[PDB]
Amino acid sequence: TRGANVIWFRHGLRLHDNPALLAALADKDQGIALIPVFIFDGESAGTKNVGYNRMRFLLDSLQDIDDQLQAATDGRGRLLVFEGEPAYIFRRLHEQVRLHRICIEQDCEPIWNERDESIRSLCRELNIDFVEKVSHTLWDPQLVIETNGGIPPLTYQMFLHTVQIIGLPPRPTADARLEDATFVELDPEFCRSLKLFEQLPTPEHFNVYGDNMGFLAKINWRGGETQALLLLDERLKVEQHAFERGFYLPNQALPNIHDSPKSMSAHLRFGCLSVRRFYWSVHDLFKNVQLRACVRGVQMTGGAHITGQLIWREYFYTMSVNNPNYDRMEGNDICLSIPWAKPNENLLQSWRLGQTGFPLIDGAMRQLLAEGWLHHTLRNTVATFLTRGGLWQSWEHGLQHFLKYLLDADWSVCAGNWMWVSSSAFERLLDSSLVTCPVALAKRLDPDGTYIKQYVPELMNVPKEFVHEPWRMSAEQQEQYECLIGVHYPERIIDLSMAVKRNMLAMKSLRNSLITPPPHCRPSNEEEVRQFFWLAD
Ligand SMILES: Cc1cc2nc3c(=O)[nH]c(=O)nc-3n(C[C@H](O)[C@H](O)[C@H](O)COP(=O)(O)OP(=O)(O)OC[C@H]3O[C@@H](n4cnc5c(N)ncnc54)[C@H](O)[C@@H]3O)c2cc1C
Ligand SMILES: [Mg+2]
Numbered sequence: 001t002r003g004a005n006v007i008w009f010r011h012g013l014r015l016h017d018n019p020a021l022l023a024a025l026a027d028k029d030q031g032i033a034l035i036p037v038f039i040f041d042g043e044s045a046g047t048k049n050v051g052y053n054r055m056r057f058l059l060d061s062l063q064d065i066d067d068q069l070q071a072a073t074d075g076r077g078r079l080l081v082f083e084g085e086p087a088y089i090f091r092r093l094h095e096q097v098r099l100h101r102i103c104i105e106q107d108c109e110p111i112w113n114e115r116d117e118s119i120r121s122l123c124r125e126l127n128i129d130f131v132e133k134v135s136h137t138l139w140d141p142q143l144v145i146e147t148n149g150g151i152p153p154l155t156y157q158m159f160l161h162t163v164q165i166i167g168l169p170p171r172p173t174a175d176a177r178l179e180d181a182t183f184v185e186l187d188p189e190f191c192r193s194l195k196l197f198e199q200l201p202t203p204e205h206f207n208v209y210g211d212n213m214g215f216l217a218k219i220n221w222r223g224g225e226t227q228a229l230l231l232l233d234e235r236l237k238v239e240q241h242a243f244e245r246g247f248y249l250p251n252q253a254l255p256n257i258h259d260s261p262k263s264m265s266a267h268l269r270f271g272c273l274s275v276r277r278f279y280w281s282v283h284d285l286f287k288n289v290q291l292r293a294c295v296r297g298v299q300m301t302g303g304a305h306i307t308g309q310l311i312w313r314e315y316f317y318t319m320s321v322n323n324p325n326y327d328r329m330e331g332n333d334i335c336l337s338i339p340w341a342k343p344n345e346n347l348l349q350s351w352r353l354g355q356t357g358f359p360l361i362d363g364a365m366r367q368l369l370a371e372g373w374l375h376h377t378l379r380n381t382v383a384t385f386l387t388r389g390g391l392w393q394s395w396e397h398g399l400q401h402f403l404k405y406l407l408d409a410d411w412s413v414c415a416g417n418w419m420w421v422s423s424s425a426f427e428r429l430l431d432s433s434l435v436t437c438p439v440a441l442a443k444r445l446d447p448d449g450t451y452i453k454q455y456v457p458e459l460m461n462v463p464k465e466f467v468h469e470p471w472r473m474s475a476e477q478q479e480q481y482e483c484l485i486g487v488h489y490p491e492r493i494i495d496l497s498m499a500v501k502r503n504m505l506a507m508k509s510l511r512n513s514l515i516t517p518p519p520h521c522r523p524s525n526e527e528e529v530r531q532f533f534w535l536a537d
Helices: 019-025 052-072 086-096 110-126 141-147 156-166 188-193 225-245 265-270 275-286 301-320 345-352 359-371 376-386 395-405 411-423 438-445 450-455 475-480 496-514 526-533
Strands: 004-009 033-040 080-083 099-105 129-133
Touching: 004 019, 004 086, 019 099, 019 129, 033 052, 033 086, 052 225, 052 265, 086 099, 086 110, 086 188, 099 110, 110 129, 141 156, 141 301, 156 301, 225 265, 225 275, 275 301, 301 411, 345 359, 345 376, 345 395, 359 376, 359 395, 359 438, 359 450, 376 395, 376 411, 376 438, 376 526, 395 411
Parallel strands: 004 033, 004 099, 033 080, 099 129
Antiparallel strands: none
């Protein structure tokens, strides 16, 4: 009529702390309509390389947005979801209703630059205002880079140094007022023509189905802004008592792999939860009070032990900004070049399918296919197992596998973690037994084998004495507990002692040739390695 503004969701799937959205609503007073839009373009929101679980999480999130738009506006406002190429969709939408601006939350990773530039140039041509707002990260990543002399901080501690110089991150914006916004009704033939969904589709609509095995699902996950805010409330409630008490109870501090769909990692990845609101509610809770206690070596004062997790996120995000080669070794200036073994299909598949014969490794890989989430310590162990503390396969194969199956799976965060863990050759402790022995670790994290039997069901009738190391069973025990090694449960696809010695050697031989390391992404020190691996030291 008088025209419309598009708020275009890719990430930033939420109504709170949404600068791009307030900007789309900035013209309510002039009768400018609002069009909420999501486009399945075969890449957006992590949809080029995606499994069932994350696709389910994304759909949940879109439904929740639509539901909220509907709730606020007595049903007048809907999320329009298309399938196709955005420039093509947007040019023709313009034809139907004059777009005055198209607002997005900045997608900062280089993999989005092409997509976003096609719309930039489209907006220039059609004289549409192209409004881009930084909101997925705590700081504008360029700010951090220009502050560090034009290169991203390559260590956590150097990143902290930089954002200390910059100052605390922006607070979240106000909440959008939707009750008085106008929405548009489009010609039905346009809607059919541009493949606008009538109802949200299911993963199968995109030819995405059940995983490399399917139904080990013990816990499940609701995507969406609503669930995010519920989880944050629970988190804050728990912190509140800890704060009042002045400390964590010994078991709140323990890695619990038998626990939650209580993580907000996927919510943060899709932006159902604003990272600034998370930051600032933790800050406000701990504001102005000195504590003494600590959590896993990290002080509690100021909530540093939690805000610090958000910094790790920001730190990998920031490193990737100007590096379209961030997800590979060859050509990546911030990744040590390491002489990995050449791709070995059998070893790789065995790893993906959880068929390595190392119970904890298999349980974790299988949990990843089933539910799409692993505790930080299981991610650690299967990553070292794949790379420097086992198979000596390159970390790229791991990254690629995680990016498909993780409910979170940020491109930058996941690659960052893969490089950090696997390629930091100067970090001697990183090759220690406390990190490369999945058996010792499995005894710490899962003493009774309950987790293991949960996801490696063939070891179910195996008793506690043997569950972590079933190959220690004699022939008679193997037959009695219905589990022959080489039939029911595979043999260890490698000799770990030998593998580890060979690999530690390549690291030594690696350091001594370079002598002085080029700047690469790495642990700031040995203490940080302790924290990162949740080491009992
Ligand atoms: C090989 C590997 C791959 C990983 N891939 C991802 C990924 O694709 N997406 C992802 O969000 N995390 C990734 N991580 C990091 C981390 O394991 C998860 O963020 C963590 O398990 C989430 O559980 P939580 O929310 O309870 O973490 P919490 O301790 O509760 O922290 C909360 C949030 O802080 C952020 N955070 C915590 N740890 C890290 C970290 N090491 N790096 C970056 N951000 C962090 C996350 O957003 C996390 O949700 C990876 C780690 C490894 C070792
Ligand atoms: Mg969380």
